[PDB]
Short mmCIF file of C-alpha atoms in Angstrom, two decimals:
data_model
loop_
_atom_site.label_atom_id
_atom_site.label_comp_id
_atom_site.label_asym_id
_atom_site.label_seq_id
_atom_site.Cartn_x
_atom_site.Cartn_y
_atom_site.Cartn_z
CA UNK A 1 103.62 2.30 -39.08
CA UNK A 2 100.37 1.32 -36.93
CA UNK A 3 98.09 2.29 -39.24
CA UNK A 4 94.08 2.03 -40.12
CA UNK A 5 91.89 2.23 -43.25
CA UNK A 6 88.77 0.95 -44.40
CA UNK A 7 88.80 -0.40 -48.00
CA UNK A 8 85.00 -0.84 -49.90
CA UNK A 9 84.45 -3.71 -51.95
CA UNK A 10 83.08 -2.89 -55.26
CA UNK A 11 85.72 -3.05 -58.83
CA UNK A 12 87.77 -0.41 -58.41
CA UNK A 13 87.96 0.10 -54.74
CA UNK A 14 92.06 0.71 -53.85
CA UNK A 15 93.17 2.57 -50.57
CA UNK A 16 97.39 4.24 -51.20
CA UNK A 17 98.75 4.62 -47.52
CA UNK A 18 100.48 3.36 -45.84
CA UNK A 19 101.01 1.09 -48.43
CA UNK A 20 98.89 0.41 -51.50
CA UNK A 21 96.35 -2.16 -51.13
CA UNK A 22 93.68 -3.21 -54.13
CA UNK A 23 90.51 -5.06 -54.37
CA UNK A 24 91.68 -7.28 -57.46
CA UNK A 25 87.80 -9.36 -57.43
CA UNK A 26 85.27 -11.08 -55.09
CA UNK A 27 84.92 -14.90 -55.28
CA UNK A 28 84.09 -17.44 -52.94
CA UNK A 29 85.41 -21.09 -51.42
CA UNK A 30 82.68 -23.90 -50.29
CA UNK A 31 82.29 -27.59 -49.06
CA UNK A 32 80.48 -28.88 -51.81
CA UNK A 33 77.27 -31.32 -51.36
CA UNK A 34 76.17 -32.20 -55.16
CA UNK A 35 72.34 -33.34 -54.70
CA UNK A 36 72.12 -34.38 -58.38
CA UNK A 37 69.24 -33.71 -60.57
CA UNK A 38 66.07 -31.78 -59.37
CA UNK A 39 63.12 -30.90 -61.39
CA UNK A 40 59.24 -29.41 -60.60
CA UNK A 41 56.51 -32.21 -60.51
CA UNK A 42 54.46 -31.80 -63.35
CA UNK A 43 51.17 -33.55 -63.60
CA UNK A 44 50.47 -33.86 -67.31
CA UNK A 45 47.38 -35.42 -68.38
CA UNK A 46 45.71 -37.43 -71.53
CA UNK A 47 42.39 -39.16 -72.63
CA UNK A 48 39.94 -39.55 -75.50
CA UNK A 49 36.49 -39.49 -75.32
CA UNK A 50 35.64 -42.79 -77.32
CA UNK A 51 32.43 -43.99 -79.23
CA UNK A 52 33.34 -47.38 -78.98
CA UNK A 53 34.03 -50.03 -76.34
CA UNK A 54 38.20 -50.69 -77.16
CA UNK A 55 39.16 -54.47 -76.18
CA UNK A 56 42.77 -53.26 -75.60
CA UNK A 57 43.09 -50.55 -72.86
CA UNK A 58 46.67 -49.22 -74.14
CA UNK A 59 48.75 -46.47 -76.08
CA UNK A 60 48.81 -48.51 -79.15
CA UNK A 61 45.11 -50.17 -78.62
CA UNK A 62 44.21 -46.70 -78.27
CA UNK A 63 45.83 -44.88 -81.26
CA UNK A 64 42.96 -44.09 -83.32
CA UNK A 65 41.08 -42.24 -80.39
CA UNK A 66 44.50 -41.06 -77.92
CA UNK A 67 47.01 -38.53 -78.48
CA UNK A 68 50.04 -40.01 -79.89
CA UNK A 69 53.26 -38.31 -78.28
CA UNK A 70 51.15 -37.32 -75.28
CA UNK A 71 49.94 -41.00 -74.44
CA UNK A 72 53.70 -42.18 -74.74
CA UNK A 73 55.20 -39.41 -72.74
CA UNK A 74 53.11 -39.60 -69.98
CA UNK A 75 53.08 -43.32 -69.84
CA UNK A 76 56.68 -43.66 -69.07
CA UNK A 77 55.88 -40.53 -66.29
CA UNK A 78 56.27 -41.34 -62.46
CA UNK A 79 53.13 -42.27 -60.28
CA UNK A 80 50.95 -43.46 -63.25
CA UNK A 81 47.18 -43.39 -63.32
CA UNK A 82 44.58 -44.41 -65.94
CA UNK A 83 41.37 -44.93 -65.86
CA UNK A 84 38.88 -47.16 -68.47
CA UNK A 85 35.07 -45.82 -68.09
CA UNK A 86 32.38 -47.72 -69.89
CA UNK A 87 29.78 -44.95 -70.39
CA UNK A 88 27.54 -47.15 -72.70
CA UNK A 89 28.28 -50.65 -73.23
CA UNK A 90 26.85 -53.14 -76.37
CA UNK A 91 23.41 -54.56 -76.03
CA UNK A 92 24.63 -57.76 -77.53
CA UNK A 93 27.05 -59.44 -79.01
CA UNK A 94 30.86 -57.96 -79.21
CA UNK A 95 33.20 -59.93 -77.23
CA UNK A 96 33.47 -59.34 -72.89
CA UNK A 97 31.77 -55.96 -74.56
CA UNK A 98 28.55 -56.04 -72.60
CA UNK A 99 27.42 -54.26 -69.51
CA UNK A 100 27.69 -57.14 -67.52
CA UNK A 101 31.63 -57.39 -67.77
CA UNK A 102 31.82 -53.59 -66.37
CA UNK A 103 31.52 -54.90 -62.52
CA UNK A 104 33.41 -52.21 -60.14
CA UNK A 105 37.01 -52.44 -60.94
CA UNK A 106 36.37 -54.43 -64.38
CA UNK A 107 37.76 -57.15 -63.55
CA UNK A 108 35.40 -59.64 -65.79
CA UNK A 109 36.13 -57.05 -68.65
CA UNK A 110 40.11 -57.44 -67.69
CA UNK A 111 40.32 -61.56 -68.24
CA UNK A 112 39.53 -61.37 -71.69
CA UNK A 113 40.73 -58.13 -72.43
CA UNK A 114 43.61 -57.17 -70.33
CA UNK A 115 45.04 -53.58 -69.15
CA UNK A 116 47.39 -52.26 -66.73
CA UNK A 117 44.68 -49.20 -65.82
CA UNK A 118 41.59 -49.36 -63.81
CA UNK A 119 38.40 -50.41 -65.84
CA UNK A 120 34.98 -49.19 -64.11
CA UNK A 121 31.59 -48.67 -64.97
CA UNK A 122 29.91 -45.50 -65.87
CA UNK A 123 26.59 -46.41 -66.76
CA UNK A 124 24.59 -43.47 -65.25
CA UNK A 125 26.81 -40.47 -67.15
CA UNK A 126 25.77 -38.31 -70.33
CA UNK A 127 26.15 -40.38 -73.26
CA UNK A 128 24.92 -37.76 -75.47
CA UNK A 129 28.44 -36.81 -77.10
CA UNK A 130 28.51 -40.18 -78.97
CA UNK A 131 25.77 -39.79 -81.27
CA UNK A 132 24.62 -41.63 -84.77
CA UNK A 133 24.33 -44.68 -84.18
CA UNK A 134 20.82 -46.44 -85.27
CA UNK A 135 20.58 -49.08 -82.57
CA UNK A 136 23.36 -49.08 -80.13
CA UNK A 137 25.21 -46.10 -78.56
CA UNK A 138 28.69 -47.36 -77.81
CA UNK A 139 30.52 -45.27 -75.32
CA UNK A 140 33.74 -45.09 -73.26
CA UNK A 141 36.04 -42.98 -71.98
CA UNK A 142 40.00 -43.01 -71.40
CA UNK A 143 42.10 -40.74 -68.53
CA UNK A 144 45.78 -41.00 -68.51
CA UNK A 145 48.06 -39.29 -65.81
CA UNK A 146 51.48 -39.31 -64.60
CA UNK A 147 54.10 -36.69 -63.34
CA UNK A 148 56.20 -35.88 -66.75
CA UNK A 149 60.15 -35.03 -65.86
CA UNK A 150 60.39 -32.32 -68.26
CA UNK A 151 64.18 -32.03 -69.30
CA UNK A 152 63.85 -28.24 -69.93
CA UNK A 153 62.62 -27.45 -66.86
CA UNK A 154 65.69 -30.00 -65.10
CA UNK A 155 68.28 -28.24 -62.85
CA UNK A 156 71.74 -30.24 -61.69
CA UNK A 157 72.11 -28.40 -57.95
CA UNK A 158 75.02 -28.04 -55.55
CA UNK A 159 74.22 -27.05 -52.16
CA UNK A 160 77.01 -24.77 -50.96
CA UNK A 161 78.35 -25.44 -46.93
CA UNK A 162 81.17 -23.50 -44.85
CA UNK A 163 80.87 -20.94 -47.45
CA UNK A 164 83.39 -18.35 -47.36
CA UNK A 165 83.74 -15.16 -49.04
CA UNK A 166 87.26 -14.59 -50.51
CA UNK A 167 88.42 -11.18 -50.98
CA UNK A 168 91.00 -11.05 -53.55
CA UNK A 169 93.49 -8.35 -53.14
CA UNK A 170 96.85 -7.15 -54.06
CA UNK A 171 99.07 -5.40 -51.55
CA UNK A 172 101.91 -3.65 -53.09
CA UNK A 173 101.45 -6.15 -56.42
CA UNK A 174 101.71 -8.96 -54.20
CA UNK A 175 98.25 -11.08 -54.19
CA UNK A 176 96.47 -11.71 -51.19
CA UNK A 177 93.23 -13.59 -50.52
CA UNK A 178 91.17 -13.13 -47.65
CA UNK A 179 89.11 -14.92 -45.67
CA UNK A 180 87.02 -15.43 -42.01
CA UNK A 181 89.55 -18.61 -42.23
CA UNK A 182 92.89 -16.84 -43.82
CA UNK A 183 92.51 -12.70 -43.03
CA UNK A 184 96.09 -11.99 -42.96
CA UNK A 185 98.53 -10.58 -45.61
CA UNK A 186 102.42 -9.50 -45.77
CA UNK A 187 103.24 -6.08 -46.73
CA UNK A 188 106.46 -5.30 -47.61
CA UNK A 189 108.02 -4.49 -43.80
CA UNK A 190 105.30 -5.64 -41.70
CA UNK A 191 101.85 -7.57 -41.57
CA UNK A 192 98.24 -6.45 -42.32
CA UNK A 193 95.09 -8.01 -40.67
CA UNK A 194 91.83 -7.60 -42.81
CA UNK A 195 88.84 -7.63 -40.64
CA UNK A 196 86.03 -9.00 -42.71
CA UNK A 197 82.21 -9.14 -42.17
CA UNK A 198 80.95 -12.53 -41.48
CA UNK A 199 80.69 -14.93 -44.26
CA UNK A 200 77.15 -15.39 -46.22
CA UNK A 201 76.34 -18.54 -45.06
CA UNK A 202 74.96 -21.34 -47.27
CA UNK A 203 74.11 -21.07 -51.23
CA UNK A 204 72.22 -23.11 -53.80
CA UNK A 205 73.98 -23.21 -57.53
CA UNK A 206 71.24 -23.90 -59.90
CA UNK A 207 73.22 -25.49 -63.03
CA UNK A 208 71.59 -24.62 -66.05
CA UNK A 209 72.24 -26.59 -69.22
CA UNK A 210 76.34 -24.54 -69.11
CA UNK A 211 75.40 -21.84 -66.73
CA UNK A 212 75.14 -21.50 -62.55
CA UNK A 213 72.08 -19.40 -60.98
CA UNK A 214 72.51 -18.73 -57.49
CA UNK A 215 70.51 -18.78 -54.26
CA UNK A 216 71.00 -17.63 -50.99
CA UNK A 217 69.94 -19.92 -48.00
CA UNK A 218 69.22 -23.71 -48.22
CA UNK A 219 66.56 -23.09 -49.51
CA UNK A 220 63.66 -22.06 -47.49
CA UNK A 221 60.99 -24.19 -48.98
CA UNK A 222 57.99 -22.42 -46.81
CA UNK A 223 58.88 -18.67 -48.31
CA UNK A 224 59.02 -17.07 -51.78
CA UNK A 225 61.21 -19.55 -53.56
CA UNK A 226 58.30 -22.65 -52.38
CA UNK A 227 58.25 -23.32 -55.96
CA UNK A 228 61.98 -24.19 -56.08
CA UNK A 229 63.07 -27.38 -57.67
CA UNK A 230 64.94 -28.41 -55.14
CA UNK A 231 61.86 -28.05 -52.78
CA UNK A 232 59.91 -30.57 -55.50
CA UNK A 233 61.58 -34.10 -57.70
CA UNK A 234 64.47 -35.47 -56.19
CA UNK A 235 66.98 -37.62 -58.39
CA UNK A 236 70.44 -38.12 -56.90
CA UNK A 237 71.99 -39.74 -60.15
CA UNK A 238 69.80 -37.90 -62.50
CA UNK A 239 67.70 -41.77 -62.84
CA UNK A 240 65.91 -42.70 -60.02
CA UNK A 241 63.72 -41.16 -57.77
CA UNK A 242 64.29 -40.87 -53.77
CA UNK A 243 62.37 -39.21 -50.64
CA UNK A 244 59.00 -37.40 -51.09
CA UNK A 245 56.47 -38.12 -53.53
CA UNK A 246 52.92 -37.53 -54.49
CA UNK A 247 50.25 -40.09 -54.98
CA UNK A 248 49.14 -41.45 -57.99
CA UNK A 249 46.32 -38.50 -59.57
CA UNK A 250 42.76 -39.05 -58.87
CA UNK A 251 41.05 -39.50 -61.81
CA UNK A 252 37.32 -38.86 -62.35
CA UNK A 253 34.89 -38.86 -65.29
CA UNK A 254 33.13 -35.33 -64.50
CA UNK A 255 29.63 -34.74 -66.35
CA UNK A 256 29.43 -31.10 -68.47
CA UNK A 257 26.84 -30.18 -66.22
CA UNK A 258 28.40 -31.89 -62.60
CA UNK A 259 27.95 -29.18 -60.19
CA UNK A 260 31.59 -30.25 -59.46
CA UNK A 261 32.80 -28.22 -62.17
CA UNK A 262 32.10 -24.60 -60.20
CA UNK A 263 34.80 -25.76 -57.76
CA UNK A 264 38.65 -26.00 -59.06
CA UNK A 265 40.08 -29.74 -58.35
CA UNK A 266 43.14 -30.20 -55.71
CA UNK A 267 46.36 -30.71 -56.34
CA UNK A 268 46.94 -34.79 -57.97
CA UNK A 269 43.43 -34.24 -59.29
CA UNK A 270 42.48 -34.76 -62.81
CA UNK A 271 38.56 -34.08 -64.21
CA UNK A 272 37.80 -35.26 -67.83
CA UNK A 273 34.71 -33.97 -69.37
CA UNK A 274 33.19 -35.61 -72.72
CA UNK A 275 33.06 -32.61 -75.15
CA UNK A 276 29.87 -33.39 -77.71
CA UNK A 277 31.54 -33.98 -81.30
CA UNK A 278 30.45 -32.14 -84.76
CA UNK A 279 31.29 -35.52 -86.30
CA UNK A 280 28.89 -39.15 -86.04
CA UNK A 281 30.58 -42.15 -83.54
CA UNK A 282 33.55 -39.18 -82.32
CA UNK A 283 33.94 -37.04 -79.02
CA UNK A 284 36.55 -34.66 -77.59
CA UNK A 285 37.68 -34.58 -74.23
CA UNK A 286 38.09 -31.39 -71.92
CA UNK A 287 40.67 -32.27 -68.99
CA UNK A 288 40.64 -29.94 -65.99
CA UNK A 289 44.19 -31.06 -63.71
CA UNK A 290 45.34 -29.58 -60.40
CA UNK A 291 48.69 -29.06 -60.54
CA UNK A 292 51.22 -29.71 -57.38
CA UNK A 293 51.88 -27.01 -55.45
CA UNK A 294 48.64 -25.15 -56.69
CA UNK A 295 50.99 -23.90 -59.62
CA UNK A 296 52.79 -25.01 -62.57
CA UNK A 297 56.46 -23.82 -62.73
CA UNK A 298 58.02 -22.30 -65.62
CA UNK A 299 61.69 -22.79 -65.11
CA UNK A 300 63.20 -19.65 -67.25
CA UNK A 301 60.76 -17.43 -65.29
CA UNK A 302 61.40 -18.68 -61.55
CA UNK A 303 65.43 -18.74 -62.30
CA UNK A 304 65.48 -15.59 -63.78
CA UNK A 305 63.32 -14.20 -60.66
CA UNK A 306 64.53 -16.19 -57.67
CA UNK A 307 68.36 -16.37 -59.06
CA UNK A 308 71.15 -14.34 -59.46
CA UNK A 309 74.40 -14.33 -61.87
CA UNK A 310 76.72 -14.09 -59.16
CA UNK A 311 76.79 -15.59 -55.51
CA UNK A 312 75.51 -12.98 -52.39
CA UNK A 313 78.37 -11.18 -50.53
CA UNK A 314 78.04 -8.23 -47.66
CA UNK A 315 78.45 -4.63 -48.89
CA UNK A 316 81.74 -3.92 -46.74
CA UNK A 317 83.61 -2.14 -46.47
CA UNK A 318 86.83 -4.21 -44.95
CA UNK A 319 88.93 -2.82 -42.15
CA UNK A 320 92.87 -3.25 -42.93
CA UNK A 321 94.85 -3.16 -39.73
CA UNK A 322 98.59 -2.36 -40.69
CA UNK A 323 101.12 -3.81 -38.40
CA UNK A 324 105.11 -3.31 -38.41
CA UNK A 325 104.72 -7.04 -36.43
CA UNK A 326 106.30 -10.01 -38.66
CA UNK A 327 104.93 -13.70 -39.01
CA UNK A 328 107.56 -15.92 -36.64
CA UNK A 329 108.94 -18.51 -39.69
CA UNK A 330 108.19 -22.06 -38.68
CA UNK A 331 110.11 -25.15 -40.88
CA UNK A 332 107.78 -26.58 -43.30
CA UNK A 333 108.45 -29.88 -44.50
CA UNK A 334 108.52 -30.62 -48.22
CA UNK A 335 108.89 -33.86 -48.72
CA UNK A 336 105.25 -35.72 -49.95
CA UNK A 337 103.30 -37.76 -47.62
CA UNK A 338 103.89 -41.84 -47.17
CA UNK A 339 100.96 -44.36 -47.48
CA UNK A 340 98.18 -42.05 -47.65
CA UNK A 341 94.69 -43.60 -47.80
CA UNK A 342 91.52 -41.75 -48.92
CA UNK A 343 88.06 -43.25 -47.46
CA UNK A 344 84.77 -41.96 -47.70
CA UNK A 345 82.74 -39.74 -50.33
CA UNK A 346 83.44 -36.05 -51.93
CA UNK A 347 81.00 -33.26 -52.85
CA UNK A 348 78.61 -35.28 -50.70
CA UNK A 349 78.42 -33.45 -47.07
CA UNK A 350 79.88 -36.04 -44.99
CA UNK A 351 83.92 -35.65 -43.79
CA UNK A 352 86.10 -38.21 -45.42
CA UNK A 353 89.21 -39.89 -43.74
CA UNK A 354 92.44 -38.76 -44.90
CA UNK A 355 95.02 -40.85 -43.31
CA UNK A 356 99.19 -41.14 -43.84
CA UNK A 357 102.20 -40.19 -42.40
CA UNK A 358 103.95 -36.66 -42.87
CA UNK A 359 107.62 -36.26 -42.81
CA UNK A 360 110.58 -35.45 -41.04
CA UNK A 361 111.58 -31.46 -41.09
CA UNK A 362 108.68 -29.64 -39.92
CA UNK A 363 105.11 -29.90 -40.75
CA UNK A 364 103.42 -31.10 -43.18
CA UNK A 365 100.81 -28.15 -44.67
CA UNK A 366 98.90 -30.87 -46.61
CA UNK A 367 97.05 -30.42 -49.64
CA UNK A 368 94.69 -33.27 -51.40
CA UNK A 369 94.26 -31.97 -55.01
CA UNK A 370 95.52 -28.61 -53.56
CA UNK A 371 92.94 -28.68 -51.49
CA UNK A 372 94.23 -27.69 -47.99
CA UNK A 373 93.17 -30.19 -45.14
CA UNK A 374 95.21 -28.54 -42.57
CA UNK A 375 99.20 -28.83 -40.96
CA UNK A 376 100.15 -31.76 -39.37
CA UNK A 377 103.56 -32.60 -37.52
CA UNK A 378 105.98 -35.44 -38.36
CA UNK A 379 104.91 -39.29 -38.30
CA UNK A 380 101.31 -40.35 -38.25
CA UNK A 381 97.95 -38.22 -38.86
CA UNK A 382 94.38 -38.85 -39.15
CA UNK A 383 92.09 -36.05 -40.21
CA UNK A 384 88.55 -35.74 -41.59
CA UNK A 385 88.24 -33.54 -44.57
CA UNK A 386 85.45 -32.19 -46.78
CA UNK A 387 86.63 -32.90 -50.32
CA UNK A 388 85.12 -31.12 -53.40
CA UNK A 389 87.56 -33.25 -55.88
CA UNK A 390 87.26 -36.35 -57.27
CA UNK A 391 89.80 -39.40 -56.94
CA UNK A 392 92.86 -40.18 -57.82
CA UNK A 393 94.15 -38.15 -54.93
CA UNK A 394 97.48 -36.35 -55.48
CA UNK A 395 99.02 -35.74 -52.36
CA UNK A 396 101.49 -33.11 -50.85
CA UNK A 397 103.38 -31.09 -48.23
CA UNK A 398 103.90 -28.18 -50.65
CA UNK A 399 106.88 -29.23 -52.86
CA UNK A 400 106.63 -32.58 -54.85
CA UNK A 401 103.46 -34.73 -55.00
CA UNK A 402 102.33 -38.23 -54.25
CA UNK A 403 99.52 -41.09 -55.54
CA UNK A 404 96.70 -41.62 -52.55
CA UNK A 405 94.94 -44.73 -52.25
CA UNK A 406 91.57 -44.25 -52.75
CA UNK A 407 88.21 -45.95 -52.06
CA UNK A 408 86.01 -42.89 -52.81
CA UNK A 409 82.42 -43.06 -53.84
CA UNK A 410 80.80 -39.92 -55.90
CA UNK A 411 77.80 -38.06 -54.53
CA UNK A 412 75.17 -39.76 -56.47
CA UNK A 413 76.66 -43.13 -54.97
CA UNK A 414 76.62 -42.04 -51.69
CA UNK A 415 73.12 -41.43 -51.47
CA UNK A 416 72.83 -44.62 -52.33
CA UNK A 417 74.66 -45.64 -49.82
#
């Protein structure tokens, strides 16, 4: 019979007549684009306050004044930045220890005593942290800054394309999944057409490690998720950096009582301030660092906020149209595809060329990893196909299966490409 029902969407959701039809689950099919790692930038900062004039402006020629683990760390960070300040230099003797060899950008200091960080002069700052000494005050002080990739706070993403909802069902016990692409099923003496509501469009899959977050959009770096990762540090092959960066941090040496200090620095900036010590010849540091973005991200937080477990579908309900019409039975060919060649990328965004030649008996409903890349008549085709699997390529009709050739590149190699 011509018949009409609407069927919600939600576990347990079945309509009886005319015949039975189930909503077995919800999932979803996608074109893949893997953007590799992503990760907040994180300006982390370092120093020492030191009563002393160091002749080796390092981690290790600065151990017994610098952090440890922090001076290491942010060393190896991206976009370094250190700065060397000579606050009070020796009256006389030392070695390229003097005044003198603290010209702007220290580089008389530098050829006896060299350092891959900036070395400047800072004779007109409070050197009243570094106290006890009988007849001369020794001064410097160290700034060390870098953007840190912390690996906690490191997300793998896949961008979701042509997304698609898939309603599973099951229509007498027979399972049926529908689509925007696919919305009809077979019921036992007829035909039934699903109207569906459009699909969601594109999603993000945070991969958390192994768990998947999901988003809803591409995202939309200029609204409430602006703090994304994906909106920040960039690594295709979870290695090396690409696109958008910031500069290297501006470092200053920032007096306790700088007028400076009743304003907040920007974003990149870093402020040290020499913190007066209880001790004779010693000094802390107090380091005051704008962070990117105006915020520092804290990746459980923003996932568990801007996430959810499952990806976005509409509420439904679907519209089954029952038919008594019957799908006209074309001859599909089973035989596997000849000389089939593979070129391109997958899980990259960009259509890769699927080549061969289908059979004699009908067409050819080809599949590349069961991936379906359309129909195609007998003798030569030539399509371009979205793949989400990796090579080899096994290749079929819809019976037996064949070895593609392949010259397929991953997604971290293709954009490198």
């Amino acid at each position: 019979e011509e018949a009409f029902t609407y069927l919600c969407t939600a576990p347990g959701c079945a309509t009886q007549t005319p015949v039975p039809v189930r909503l077995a689950g919800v999932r979803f099919e996608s074109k893949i684009v893997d953007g590799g790692c992503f990760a907040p930038w994180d300006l982390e900062a370092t120093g020492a306050c030191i009563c002393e004039i160091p002749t080796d402006v390092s981690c290790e020629g600065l151990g017994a004044w610098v952090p440890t683990a922090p001076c290491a760390r942010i060393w190896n960070g991206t976009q370094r930045a250190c700065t060397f300040w000579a606050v009070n230099a020796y009256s006389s003797g030392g070695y390229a220890q003097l005044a003198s060899y603290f010209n702007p950008g220290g580089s008389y200091y530098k050829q006896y005593h060299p350092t891959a960080c900036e070395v400047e002069p800072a004779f007109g700052h409070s050197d009243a942290a570094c106290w006890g000494f009988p007849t001369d005050t020794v001064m410097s002080v160290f700034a060390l800054a870098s953007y840190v990739q912390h690996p906690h706070k490191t997300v793998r993403v896949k961008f979701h394309t042509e997304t698609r909802t898939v309603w599973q069902l099951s229509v007498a016990g027979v399972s049926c999944n529908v689509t925007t692409e696919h919305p009809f099923c077979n019921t036992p003496h007829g035909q039934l057409e699903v109207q569906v509501p459009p699909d969601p469009g594109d999603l993000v899959e945070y991969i958390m490690n192994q768990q998947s977050r999901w988003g809803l959009g591409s995202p939309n770096c200029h609204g409430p998720d602006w703090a994304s990762p994906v909106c920040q540090r960039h690594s295709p092959d979870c290695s090396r950096l690409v696109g958008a960066t910031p500069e290297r941090p501006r470092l200053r040496l920032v007096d306790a009582d700088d007028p400076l200090l009743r304003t907040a620095p920007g974003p990149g900036e870093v402020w040290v301030t020499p913190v007066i010590g209880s001790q004779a010849r010693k000094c802390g540091l107090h380091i005051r660092a704008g962070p990117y973005g105006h915020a520092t991200v804290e990746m459980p937080e923003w996932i568990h906020a801007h996430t959810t477990s499952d990806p976005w579908h509409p509420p439904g309900p679907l519209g089954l149209k029952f038919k008594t019409v019957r799908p006209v039975a074309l001859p599909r060919a089973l035989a596997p595809p000849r000389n089939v060649r593979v070129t391109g990328c997958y899980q990259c965004g960009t259509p890769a060329l699927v080549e061969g030649l289908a059979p004699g008996g009908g067409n050819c409903h080809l599949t590349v990893n069961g991936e379906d890349v359309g129909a195609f008549p007998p003798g030569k085709f030539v399509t371009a196909a979205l793949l989400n699997t990796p090579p080899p390529y096994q290749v079929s009709c819809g019976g037996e299966s064949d070895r593609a050739s392949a010259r397929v590149i991953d997604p971290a190699a293709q954009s490198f490409t």
